[PDB]
């Protein structure tokens, strides 16, 4: 097989292709790009089959959370396996790899792919995989093996080949096979060592034995084989470890140490919820100038990580820097480890695929492991259980896709806010001493041609659709921007505008000061008052669309209205204004103009979904105007920089941000530091996917882009990395 040339040849009985999911623990993407030619069996798979540049793991980049994510399509917060070592307060039990509690089904939520196949009339076998030797939802796979780490790889392969030799009635359609290397070697001697080379050669022989075994049965081109990893590997040093003794005079708390630390009380379960989590994060914030970790209260963590909505995830979290460690005391440190941020290049996993369903000799762009579950379902011809993968985003991997995706149906239609009179019925305690005749409101009145012109420029991919039931809203059209106004919350849900490529940075008009007026289109009962922000001293009004970004002085008046106001904390406003005044211009030059869609996010229950009106817990003092938890900024331009975003036929380039709306900038540590040294760093830290923005807002983007839904899903699941 290994010497044989590249190839739907299935023998008698095999009507449907069998699916084999092969995991090689800690096989980082870097190992494939550098050492592939030293591994002839995996190199043939790379040459003949399909492979991604890398597969993004889930945070924390550990074995049990990631392996269970691959088979469920769920984030650790939803499936429950948040770490290899964890504690549940309600169960009052400790979970570990060396404990009996790992076999308790109470810890395992969701529906793994073996159960999905079993519930839909197919048989499933497994030679190891976290959760496969556990009676998840009161059921084990048809054939499974109780975990035993030292069983030789040949014996694991031989038993799997016996299962493929079984009669059609007994023969499973889905298979899992797990291997401990090159993770074990990575921990021992580091990612770039002789130990990992030997381990990579060992896993290549194991894969070679499987492929040669399949070739004898004439199943080498029949079987839909997937070779992947749970996470990557990085180098650790005893000279690169932060100690909690250097920050606290006395440690009375419990700490889950390493690359993804979690802090809780020692007095469990009595002091669990009582524990001052907010004190720990405050006492660890900006303590040292060259601090190699950042404390976070779980709802404040970057939204793209989706690591907060679970009782097992302790409120205190530490985001450890590349190649560093965080321990309780100075009293293992050498070699290598994983568990760090999934965006780190060293944490990237491998993904290779071969079979009749997969495209041959194909290199695909990086994707996330949460997407694998839907692909496994399409391969097995089964309906997927509710998961976090975008069904259809992985269709470019298949020769003939099983599922055809469609755009999310709009649940609420736009109504009202039409121009009737240029005279305001209510002043709303707003003042602009510059206006003289106030007939500038005639510019807010746009004819069918004027509306189409701004819809062509500022809405090139179509208006974001409202995927919310009974959401009273209207579209507000202006010559420089278009917004979707939320009537009940008295602010816009989204504001879309395409800034063209600017010429010079030196000559830039400032925002018209002390000028604010009522929008004649929106009813005063559905509008914000300027007096609302005078009463509340902590929050002030902010502009969602920057008035001075487009046109002239007369164009600014179209944005100096009550409908363009959003509640903002003074400290957040410093980041918001700097981004639109300095960073946005810089980005607009780099990608030949940029389309911006901005708006508020409400996620008080930190579940990654948009809040229902009853879920919002903070409002503008003495008013029903809600306070956003986050603000989104989705930058869209074209992949081919020769075209502007408003006039482009090819693929689009996206840069989404989900920035927390916090009263302080303690996350950035900006003490005696100008905005040019921390604002961009803070925005880049809170980069997310378009899908993340979509779930947090109940909006759906790019529904009017002439491209298949499957291709638009690739753009929506894309995570920009720097
Ligand atoms: C995996 O290990 C478990 C636990 O040792 C085995 O389950 C026991 O099987 C016996 C006989 O079928 C039952 O009487 C017990 O009730 C089971 N549970 C326990 C906790 O003892 C299981 O059979 C093993 N599976 C394989 C494939 O070897
Ligand atoms: C889970 O493991 C932790 C850590 O070993 C145990 O924590 C101890 O709990 C007692 C109270 O029950 C405290 O007085 C100790 O200070 C804790 N020790 C540490 C090191 O944190 C906990 O009891 C275990 N729980 C179960 C149910 O096994
Ligand atoms: C990931 O997918 C799961 C499953 O669809 C989502 O969890 C469900 O959320 C609803 C609403 O909060 C609950 O009623 C269900 O009980 C949850 N199911 C499970 C299995 O946990 C989860 O919200 C999704 N996450 C994101 C960020 O979209
Ligand atoms: N199903 C399992 N049950 C118990 N331990 C396991 C299982 N699968 C893997 N392991 C262990 O987890 C280790 C990898 O975990 P990690 O250190 O997080 O990369 C392996 O070397 C095994 O010893
Ligand atoms: C658990 O199994 C039952 C059938 O026995 C099924 O109806 C249910 O949906 C399953 N739940 C999960 C989370 O897989
Ligand atoms: C970009 O578009 C131009 C046409 O405007 C075309 O000539 C060029 O080849 C395109 N480049 C890429 C990389 O697609
Ligand atoms: Ca929510
Ligand atoms: Zn692992
Ligand atoms: Zn490991």
mmCIF file with all atom_site columns, N, CA and C in Angstrom, residues 548-589:
data_model
loop_
_atom_site.group_PDB
_atom_site.id
_atom_site.type_symbol
_atom_site.label_atom_id
_atom_site.label_alt_id
_atom_site.label_comp_id
_atom_site.label_asym_id
_atom_site.label_entity_id
_atom_site.label_seq_id
_atom_site.pdbx_PDB_ins_code
_atom_site.Cartn_x
_atom_site.Cartn_y
_atom_site.Cartn_z
_atom_site.occupancy
_atom_site.B_iso_or_equiv
_atom_site.pdbx_formal_charge
_atom_site.auth_seq_id
_atom_site.auth_comp_id
_atom_site.auth_asym_id
_atom_site.auth_atom_id
_atom_site.pdbx_PDB_model_num
ATOM 1   N N  . UNK A 1 548 ? -18.252 61.516 11.625 1.00 0.00 ? 548 UNK A N  1
ATOM 2   C CA . UNK A 1 548 ? -17.200 62.113 10.800 1.00 0.00 ? 548 UNK A CA 1
ATOM 3   C C  . UNK A 1 548 ? -16.436 61.152 9.855  1.00 0.00 ? 548 UNK A C  1
ATOM 4   N N  . UNK A 1 549 ? -16.781 59.846 9.833  1.00 0.00 ? 549 UNK A N  1
ATOM 5   C CA . UNK A 1 549 ? -16.094 58.854 8.991  1.00 0.00 ? 549 UNK A CA 1
ATOM 6   C C  . UNK A 1 549 ? -16.340 59.066 7.474  1.00 0.00 ? 549 UNK A C  1
ATOM 7   N N  . UNK A 1 550 ? -17.557 59.486 7.083  1.00 0.00 ? 550 UNK A N  1
ATOM 8   C CA . UNK A 1 550 ? -17.928 59.678 5.679  1.00 0.00 ? 550 UNK A CA 1
ATOM 9   C C  . UNK A 1 550 ? -18.550 61.044 5.391  1.00 0.00 ? 550 UNK A C  1
ATOM 10  N N  . UNK A 1 551 ? -18.426 61.480 4.136  1.00 0.00 ? 551 UNK A N  1
ATOM 11  C CA . UNK A 1 551 ? -18.972 62.736 3.631  1.00 0.00 ? 551 UNK A CA 1
ATOM 12  C C  . UNK A 1 551 ? -18.327 63.991 4.181  1.00 0.00 ? 551 UNK A C  1
ATOM 13  N N  . UNK A 1 552 ? -19.134 65.061 4.318  1.00 0.00 ? 552 UNK A N  1
ATOM 14  C CA . UNK A 1 552 ? -18.714 66.375 4.817  1.00 0.00 ? 552 UNK A CA 1
ATOM 15  C C  . UNK A 1 552 ? -19.398 66.730 6.157  1.00 0.00 ? 552 UNK A C  1
ATOM 16  N N  . UNK A 1 553 ? -19.403 68.031 6.531  1.00 0.00 ? 553 UNK A N  1
ATOM 17  C CA . UNK A 1 553 ? -20.024 68.546 7.757  1.00 0.00 ? 553 UNK A CA 1
ATOM 18  C C  . UNK A 1 553 ? -21.544 68.359 7.749  1.00 0.00 ? 553 UNK A C  1
ATOM 19  N N  . UNK A 1 554 ? -22.181 68.533 6.572  1.00 0.00 ? 554 UNK A N  1
ATOM 20  C CA . UNK A 1 554 ? -23.625 68.368 6.378  1.00 0.00 ? 554 UNK A CA 1
ATOM 21  C C  . UNK A 1 554 ? -24.029 66.888 6.505  1.00 0.00 ? 554 UNK A C  1
ATOM 22  N N  . UNK A 1 555 ? -23.122 65.964 6.116  1.00 0.00 ? 555 UNK A N  1
ATOM 23  C CA . UNK A 1 555 ? -23.315 64.512 6.201  1.00 0.00 ? 555 UNK A CA 1
ATOM 24  C C  . UNK A 1 555 ? -23.331 64.031 7.657  1.00 0.00 ? 555 UNK A C  1
ATOM 25  N N  . UNK A 1 556 ? -22.562 64.708 8.543  1.00 0.00 ? 556 UNK A N  1
ATOM 26  C CA . UNK A 1 556 ? -22.457 64.404 9.976  1.00 0.00 ? 556 UNK A CA 1
ATOM 27  C C  . UNK A 1 556 ? -23.799 64.498 10.703 1.00 0.00 ? 556 UNK A C  1
ATOM 28  N N  . UNK A 1 557 ? -24.657 65.470 10.312 1.00 0.00 ? 557 UNK A N  1
ATOM 29  C CA . UNK A 1 557 ? -25.990 65.695 10.892 1.00 0.00 ? 557 UNK A CA 1
ATOM 30  C C  . UNK A 1 557 ? -26.926 64.488 10.767 1.00 0.00 ? 557 UNK A C  1
ATOM 31  N N  . UNK A 1 558 ? -26.709 63.635 9.742  1.00 0.00 ? 558 UNK A N  1
ATOM 32  C CA . UNK A 1 558 ? -27.481 62.411 9.508  1.00 0.00 ? 558 UNK A CA 1
ATOM 33  C C  . UNK A 1 558 ? -27.181 61.341 10.574 1.00 0.00 ? 558 UNK A C  1
ATOM 34  N N  . UNK A 1 559 ? -26.080 61.519 11.335 1.00 0.00 ? 559 UNK A N  1
ATOM 35  C CA . UNK A 1 559 ? -25.630 60.615 12.394 1.00 0.00 ? 559 UNK A CA 1
ATOM 36  C C  . UNK A 1 559 ? -25.710 61.238 13.796 1.00 0.00 ? 559 UNK A C  1
ATOM 37  N N  . UNK A 1 560 ? -25.939 62.561 13.881 1.00 0.00 ? 560 UNK A N  1
ATOM 38  C CA . UNK A 1 560 ? -26.055 63.275 15.159 1.00 0.00 ? 560 UNK A CA 1
ATOM 39  C C  . UNK A 1 560 ? -27.523 63.267 15.638 1.00 0.00 ? 560 UNK A C  1
ATOM 40  N N  . UNK A 1 561 ? -28.152 62.073 15.607 1.00 0.00 ? 561 UNK A N  1
ATOM 41  C CA . UNK A 1 561 ? -29.553 61.838 15.972 1.00 0.00 ? 561 UNK A CA 1
ATOM 42  C C  . UNK A 1 561 ? -29.704 60.767 17.066 1.00 0.00 ? 561 UNK A C  1
ATOM 43  N N  . UNK A 1 562 ? -30.848 60.793 17.792 1.00 0.00 ? 562 UNK A N  1
ATOM 44  C CA . UNK A 1 562 ? -31.181 59.880 18.903 1.00 0.00 ? 562 UNK A CA 1
ATOM 45  C C  . UNK A 1 562 ? -31.125 58.393 18.547 1.00 0.00 ? 562 UNK A C  1
ATOM 46  N N  . UNK A 1 563 ? -31.384 58.057 17.273 1.00 0.00 ? 563 UNK A N  1
ATOM 47  C CA . UNK A 1 563 ? -31.387 56.685 16.769 1.00 0.00 ? 563 UNK A CA 1
ATOM 48  C C  . UNK A 1 563 ? -29.982 56.096 16.556 1.00 0.00 ? 563 UNK A C  1
ATOM 49  N N  . UNK A 1 564 ? -28.936 56.942 16.580 1.00 0.00 ? 564 UNK A N  1
ATOM 50  C CA . UNK A 1 564 ? -27.544 56.519 16.406 1.00 0.00 ? 564 UNK A CA 1
ATOM 51  C C  . UNK A 1 564 ? -26.816 56.418 17.766 1.00 0.00 ? 564 UNK A C  1
ATOM 52  N N  . UNK A 1 565 ? -27.551 56.634 18.876 1.00 0.00 ? 565 UNK A N  1
ATOM 53  C CA . UNK A 1 565 ? -26.989 56.567 20.223 1.00 0.00 ? 565 UNK A CA 1
ATOM 54  C C  . UNK A 1 565 ? -27.122 55.196 20.870 1.00 0.00 ? 565 UNK A C  1
ATOM 55  N N  . UNK A 1 566 ? -26.059 54.782 21.576 1.00 0.00 ? 566 UNK A N  1
ATOM 56  C CA . UNK A 1 566 ? -25.956 53.520 22.316 1.00 0.00 ? 566 UNK A CA 1
ATOM 57  C C  . UNK A 1 566 ? -25.348 53.782 23.715 1.00 0.00 ? 566 UNK A C  1
ATOM 58  N N  . UNK A 1 567 ? -25.755 53.052 24.791 1.00 0.00 ? 567 UNK A N  1
ATOM 59  C CA . UNK A 1 567 ? -25.176 53.322 26.123 1.00 0.00 ? 567 UNK A CA 1
ATOM 60  C C  . UNK A 1 567 ? -23.725 52.863 26.226 1.00 0.00 ? 567 UNK A C  1
ATOM 61  N N  . UNK A 1 568 ? -22.824 53.767 26.648 1.00 0.00 ? 568 UNK A N  1
ATOM 62  C CA . UNK A 1 568 ? -21.404 53.440 26.754 1.00 0.00 ? 568 UNK A CA 1
ATOM 63  C C  . UNK A 1 568 ? -20.722 53.907 28.025 1.00 0.00 ? 568 UNK A C  1
ATOM 64  N N  . UNK A 1 569 ? -19.854 53.045 28.582 1.00 0.00 ? 569 UNK A N  1
ATOM 65  C CA . UNK A 1 569 ? -19.048 53.383 29.753 1.00 0.00 ? 569 UNK A CA 1
ATOM 66  C C  . UNK A 1 569 ? -17.929 54.295 29.262 1.00 0.00 ? 569 UNK A C  1
ATOM 67  N N  . UNK A 1 570 ? -17.596 55.339 30.049 1.00 0.00 ? 570 UNK A N  1
ATOM 68  C CA . UNK A 1 570 ? -16.554 56.328 29.737 1.00 0.00 ? 570 UNK A CA 1
ATOM 69  C C  . UNK A 1 570 ? -15.239 55.678 29.280 1.00 0.00 ? 570 UNK A C  1
ATOM 70  N N  . UNK A 1 571 ? -14.781 54.632 30.000 1.00 0.00 ? 571 UNK A N  1
ATOM 71  C CA . UNK A 1 571 ? -13.552 53.895 29.687 1.00 0.00 ? 571 UNK A CA 1
ATOM 72  C C  . UNK A 1 571 ? -13.642 53.112 28.377 1.00 0.00 ? 571 UNK A C  1
ATOM 73  N N  . UNK A 1 572 ? -14.818 52.511 28.085 1.00 0.00 ? 572 UNK A N  1
ATOM 74  C CA . UNK A 1 572 ? -15.044 51.771 26.840 1.00 0.00 ? 572 UNK A CA 1
ATOM 75  C C  . UNK A 1 572 ? -15.073 52.729 25.645 1.00 0.00 ? 572 UNK A C  1
ATOM 76  N N  . UNK A 1 573 ? -15.650 53.937 25.844 1.00 0.00 ? 573 UNK A N  1
ATOM 77  C CA . UNK A 1 573 ? -15.764 54.998 24.838 1.00 0.00 ? 573 UNK A CA 1
ATOM 78  C C  . UNK A 1 573 ? -14.386 55.421 24.319 1.00 0.00 ? 573 UNK A C  1
ATOM 79  N N  . UNK A 1 574 ? -13.347 55.360 25.183 1.00 0.00 ? 574 UNK A N  1
ATOM 80  C CA . UNK A 1 574 ? -11.954 55.676 24.843 1.00 0.00 ? 574 UNK A CA 1
ATOM 81  C C  . UNK A 1 574 ? -11.416 54.666 23.814 1.00 0.00 ? 574 UNK A C  1
ATOM 82  N N  . UNK A 1 575 ? -11.790 53.375 23.963 1.00 0.00 ? 575 UNK A N  1
ATOM 83  C CA . UNK A 1 575 ? -11.414 52.290 23.048 1.00 0.00 ? 575 UNK A CA 1
ATOM 84  C C  . UNK A 1 575 ? -12.215 52.395 21.751 1.00 0.00 ? 575 UNK A C  1
ATOM 85  N N  . UNK A 1 576 ? -13.539 52.642 21.873 1.00 0.00 ? 576 UNK A N  1
ATOM 86  C CA . UNK A 1 576 ? -14.491 52.759 20.767 1.00 0.00 ? 576 UNK A CA 1
ATOM 87  C C  . UNK A 1 576 ? -14.134 53.906 19.830 1.00 0.00 ? 576 UNK A C  1
ATOM 88  N N  . UNK A 1 577 ? -13.874 55.108 20.389 1.00 0.00 ? 577 UNK A N  1
ATOM 89  C CA . UNK A 1 577 ? -13.499 56.294 19.616 1.00 0.00 ? 577 UNK A CA 1
ATOM 90  C C  . UNK A 1 577 ? -12.146 56.128 18.941 1.00 0.00 ? 577 UNK A C  1
ATOM 91  N N  . UNK A 1 578 ? -11.152 55.534 19.647 1.00 0.00 ? 578 UNK A N  1
ATOM 92  C CA . UNK A 1 578 ? -9.816  55.294 19.090 1.00 0.00 ? 578 UNK A CA 1
ATOM 93  C C  . UNK A 1 578 ? -9.858  54.315 17.918 1.00 0.00 ? 578 UNK A C  1
ATOM 94  N N  . UNK A 1 579 ? -10.712 53.278 18.010 1.00 0.00 ? 579 UNK A N  1
ATOM 95  C CA . UNK A 1 579 ? -10.872 52.279 16.958 1.00 0.00 ? 579 UNK A CA 1
ATOM 96  C C  . UNK A 1 579 ? -11.434 52.900 15.675 1.00 0.00 ? 579 UNK A C  1
ATOM 97  N N  . UNK A 1 580 ? -12.497 53.717 15.785 1.00 0.00 ? 580 UNK A N  1
ATOM 98  C CA . UNK A 1 580 ? -13.152 54.347 14.635 1.00 0.00 ? 580 UNK A CA 1
ATOM 99  C C  . UNK A 1 580 ? -12.388 55.545 14.060 1.00 0.00 ? 580 UNK A C  1
ATOM 100 N N  . UNK A 1 581 ? -11.596 56.250 14.893 1.00 0.00 ? 581 UNK A N  1
ATOM 101 C CA . UNK A 1 581 ? -10.822 57.422 14.474 1.00 0.00 ? 581 UNK A CA 1
ATOM 102 C C  . UNK A 1 581 ? -9.442  57.065 13.900 1.00 0.00 ? 581 UNK A C  1
ATOM 103 N N  . UNK A 1 582 ? -8.763  56.048 14.470 1.00 0.00 ? 582 UNK A N  1
ATOM 104 C CA . UNK A 1 582 ? -7.401  55.686 14.063 1.00 0.00 ? 582 UNK A CA 1
ATOM 105 C C  . UNK A 1 582 ? -7.313  54.309 13.367 1.00 0.00 ? 582 UNK A C  1
ATOM 106 N N  . UNK A 1 583 ? -7.716  53.225 14.058 1.00 0.00 ? 583 UNK A N  1
ATOM 107 C CA . UNK A 1 583 ? -7.609  51.845 13.566 1.00 0.00 ? 583 UNK A CA 1
ATOM 108 C C  . UNK A 1 583 ? -8.431  51.542 12.310 1.00 0.00 ? 583 UNK A C  1
ATOM 109 N N  . UNK A 1 584 ? -9.692  52.013 12.258 1.00 0.00 ? 584 UNK A N  1
ATOM 110 C CA . UNK A 1 584 ? -10.619 51.803 11.143 1.00 0.00 ? 584 UNK A CA 1
ATOM 111 C C  . UNK A 1 584 ? -10.102 52.396 9.833  1.00 0.00 ? 584 UNK A C  1
ATOM 112 N N  . UNK A 1 585 ? -9.450  53.578 9.899  1.00 0.00 ? 585 UNK A N  1
ATOM 113 C CA . UNK A 1 585 ? -8.842  54.258 8.751  1.00 0.00 ? 585 UNK A CA 1
ATOM 114 C C  . UNK A 1 585 ? -7.662  53.414 8.245  1.00 0.00 ? 585 UNK A C  1
ATOM 115 N N  . UNK A 1 586 ? -6.816  52.926 9.180  1.00 0.00 ? 586 UNK A N  1
ATOM 116 C CA . UNK A 1 586 ? -5.660  52.060 8.917  1.00 0.00 ? 586 UNK A CA 1
ATOM 117 C C  . UNK A 1 586 ? -6.106  50.772 8.209  1.00 0.00 ? 586 UNK A C  1
ATOM 118 N N  . UNK A 1 587 ? -7.213  50.152 8.680  1.00 0.00 ? 587 UNK A N  1
ATOM 119 C CA . UNK A 1 587 ? -7.761  48.930 8.083  1.00 0.00 ? 587 UNK A CA 1
ATOM 120 C C  . UNK A 1 587 ? -8.356  49.197 6.701  1.00 0.00 ? 587 UNK A C  1
ATOM 121 N N  . UNK A 1 588 ? -9.030  50.356 6.528  1.00 0.00 ? 588 UNK A N  1
ATOM 122 C CA . UNK A 1 588 ? -9.648  50.772 5.265  1.00 0.00 ? 588 UNK A CA 1
ATOM 123 C C  . UNK A 1 588 ? -8.627  50.962 4.135  1.00 0.00 ? 588 UNK A C  1
ATOM 124 N N  . UNK A 1 589 ? -7.395  51.407 4.469  1.00 0.00 ? 589 UNK A N  1
ATOM 125 C CA . UNK A 1 589 ? -6.299  51.591 3.509  1.00 0.00 ? 589 UNK A CA 1
ATOM 126 C C  . UNK A 1 589 ? -5.772  50.207 3.076  1.00 0.00 ? 589 UNK A C  1
#
